[PDB]
Write a protein that binds this ligand. Structure first.
Ligand SMILES: O=C(O)CN1CC[C@H]2[C@@H]1[C@H](c1cccc(Cl)c1)[C@]1(C(=O)Nc3cc(Cl)ccc31)N2CC1CC1
Length: 94
């Protein structure tokens, strides 16, 4: 269970995550986690990596997203795992 404050977290993406973000949004130095989740969602949706009618699984073994996250697939319901996969591709700033 994810507290609402998580979305406010300010982050500086590492180069591979920044590459992915630049294919769907404007480049800038710092993003909120709300922005990162939105942009990665749009990346997934636009590239049709998500099978909503197949156990809510994103399939990313044939995509740079798979290299970012280090998995061939994952469930969009496993929220803490998603946060952890994302965190390892950025630096939190405060
Ligand atoms: O129904 C749910 O439980 C979550 N939802 C399932 C559908 C939405 C959303 C999910 C999400 C929102 C917020 C926090 C978290 Cl951890 C995950 C999200 C999203 O909004 N951004 C994002 C980013 C990544 Cl990397 C993976 C999945 C998603 N989905 C986008 C669809 C293209 C898959």
């Amino acid at each position: 269970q994810i507290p609402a404050s998580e979305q406010e977290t300010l982050v500086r993406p590492k180069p591979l995550l920044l590459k992915l973000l630049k294919s769907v949004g404007a480049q800038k130095d710092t993003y909120t986690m709300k922005e990162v989740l939105f942009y990665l969602g749009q990346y997934i949706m636009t590239k049709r990596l998500y099978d909503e009618k197949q156990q809510h699984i994103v399939y990313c073994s044939n995509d740079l997203l798979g290299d970012l996250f280090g998995v061939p697939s994952f469930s969009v319901k496993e929220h803490r795992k998603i946060y952890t996969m994302i965190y390892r591709n950025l630096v939190v700033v405060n």
